[PDB]
Design a protein around this ligand. Structure first.
Ligand code: AIX
Length: 260
């Protein structure tokens, strides 16, 4: 098709490996590029950890208000929010917001501990029908993004289908789904990614991710005013371990997609 040629064109211009999946929920049609390929999710896996805690909240109604200690042993490479509350507590809602809207790695690890380990995150993915997602490690080592390593990976197709079920479908409760949607709106880390390639009149909820080998990821759910919603997944990784981030590729992929 035409979109596949331009996506393949910008992948060649980038020197890396692009993975794209858009779900057009108007006709339930799909446009995919390397859609069944394994990519490191990096911090985009935090959506699955936040959604899994939200699923736990459908029986323990008062769970997001439960305080959780933050103390020096908990801090790792990048903790923009949990750094402010060391030797204090942080409720599971403020850690979920820190993980989604600021990509706080300590918040992720607290989300992972609440679920009983990374196997508890993968469990929730299998329960909602995702057989491809797998979380193996905690932050920050889940961002190693070594080529060929199946650890902490998924495919663009699977993550787009899952993100549709979480934010648009009914894999979560309505109070849970509205909370995750409201969280993805408040994201502060995706200005130069998928958002930069979409019309400004388009409201977007997204979660970014980045790691070694220049991995630059972004998953988004998009609501054009007057039109049926879209979910977009753009994964990108590079051959050099020390490669720099390429958020511009993610914006250009979304621009090629938005022209459809
Ligand atoms: C997940 O993607 C996280 N990335 C890391 O922990 C990497 N070790 C790292 C890469 C680059 C700079 C700092 C740490 C966090 N999520 C990224 C993102 O959302 O773009 C991040 C750069 C904010 S860190």
């Amino acid at each position: 098709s035409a979109v596949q040629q331009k996506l393949a064109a910008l992948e060649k211009s980038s020197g890396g490996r692009l993975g794209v999946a858009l779900i057009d929920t108007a006709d339930n049609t799909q446009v995919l590029y390397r859609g069944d390929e394994r990519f490191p999710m990096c911090s985009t896996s935090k959506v699955m950890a936040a959604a899994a805690v939200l699923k736990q909240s459908e029986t323990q109604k008062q769970l997001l208000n439960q305080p959780v200690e933050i103390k020096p042993a908990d801090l790792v490479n990048y903790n923009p929010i949990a750094e402010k509350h060391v030797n204090g507590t942080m409720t599971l809602a403020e850690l979920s917001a820190a993980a989604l809207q600021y990509s706080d790695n300590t918040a992720m690890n607290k989300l992972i501990a609440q679920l009983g380990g990374p196997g508890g995150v993968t469990a929730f993915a299998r329960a909602i029908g995702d057989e491809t997602f797998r979380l193996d490690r905690t932050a920050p080592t889940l961002n190693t993004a070594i080529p060929g390593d199946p650890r902490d990976t998924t495919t663009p197709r699977a993550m787009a289908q899952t993100l549709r079920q979480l934010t648009l479908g009914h894999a979560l409760g309505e109070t849970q789904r509205a909370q995750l949607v409201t969280w993805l709106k408040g994201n502060t880390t995706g200005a130069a990614s998928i958002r930069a390639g979409l019309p400004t009149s388009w409201t977007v909820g997204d979660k970014t991710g980045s790691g070694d080998y220049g991995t630059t990821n972004d998953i988004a759910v998009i609501w054009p005013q007057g039109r049926a919603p879209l979910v977009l997944v753009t994964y990108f990784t590079q051959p050099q371990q020390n490669a720099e981030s390429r958020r511009d590729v993610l914006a250009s992929a979304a621009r090629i997609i938005a022209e459809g």
